[PDB]
Amino acid sequence: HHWGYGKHNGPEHWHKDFPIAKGERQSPVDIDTHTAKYDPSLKPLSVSYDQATSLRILNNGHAFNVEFDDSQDKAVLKGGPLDGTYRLIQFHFHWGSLDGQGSEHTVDKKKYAAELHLVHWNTKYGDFGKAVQQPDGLAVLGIFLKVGSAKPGLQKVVDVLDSIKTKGKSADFTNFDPRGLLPESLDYWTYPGSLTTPPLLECVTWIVLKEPISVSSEQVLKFRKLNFNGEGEPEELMVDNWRPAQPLKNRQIKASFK
Ligand SMILES: On1ccc(F)cc1=S
Ligand SMILES: [Zn+2]
């Protein structure tokens, strides 16, 4: 009886194994666009992904992770609200059963069809495992997906999902360029929060881009053919793997833009 997204093991249950689920800096949150404060002192965000080395794609039973070689400063996030250098370790998505839901963050209570999380760890802590124990350990770049035109830079991800249908399957996934997943604008909201899955550690500077990317109905349909279950278990479609909005409590969302 492990955590999941079902009636018996979903987000309303997580607090029993992970009591920080009811903590002071949980994620995601609703972004109230009229309450977020423009902070003219935020530096421009620096996304340096030209030397990014993708290695592998994994179905972990909750999502799929596209994993990167994080053994050198090859794909880094810097600037914006961040002090120092954060190394890209993986990206994943959260998505719905229907185009009307799927994102974790909301914007004036609007739910997008999906949300991309590019996960980076603070190099001052040496590895990801130590970084997640620090209040400034991670920087997650959050990008909303809406359904419309195809995102060409996503198709290589969509085409390998057949090969990782069930929990614990992986596949070689070299030479994937995550720059093909970014929108034009790097305008963002930022606030201190958490992982959105167990163990829900309060180690994340969230950087949520204002501009969504467009993906095709056919692209998100392929996300929804994945399985939470392992091979030769009853089929449970990997859908609605999103945590809903948590209490803002004593936190200020800042906007990089007027
Ligand atoms: O869901 N998830 C899992 C790992 C991680 F580092 C960040 C997030 S958002
Ligand atoms: Zn996530």
Q: Is 190 annotated as a binding residue?
A: no
Question: Would you say the CB of residue 194 lies under 6 angstroms from ligand 1?
Answer: no
Whether residue 2 lies in the annotated active site: no
How far is it, in rounded angstroms, from Cα 113 to Cα 146?
5
Give the span between the Cα atoms of 12 and 15, in whole angstroms. 7
**What is the chain's Cα-based Rg?**
17
What's the 69 CA to ligand 1 centre distance in angstroms?
17
Residue 16's SS3 state is: helix
Q: Where are the alpha helices (DSSP H) in 72-161?
A: 128-131, 155-160
Q: How far is CA 21 from CA 16, 110, 134, in A?
A: 9, 23, 17
Nearest-atom index, ligand 1, CA of 27: 9
The Cβ-side half-sphere exposure at 223, using a 13 Å CA radius, reads 29
Cα separation, 149 vs 155, whole angstroms: 12
Residues with CB under 5 A from ligand 2 (ion): 117, 196
**Looking at 36-187, which runs of residues are DSSP E strands?**
37-38, 45-48, 54-59, 64-68, 76-79, 86-95, 106-107, 114-122, 138-147, 170-172
Q: What residue has token string 């400063």?
A: 73
Point out the catalytic residue in the list 8, 13, 34, 62: 62
Amino acid (1-letter code) at residue 77? L
CATH fold, domain 2-258, is Carbonic Anhydrase II (3.10.200)
C-alpha 256/C-alpha 111 separation (Å) is: 21
Task: Report residue 122 as tokens.
Answer: 């603070």
Q: Rounded CA gap, 5 and 32, in Å? A: 26
197 is in an annotated binding site: yes
Q: Please indicate if the annotation marks 196 as binding a ligand.
A: yes
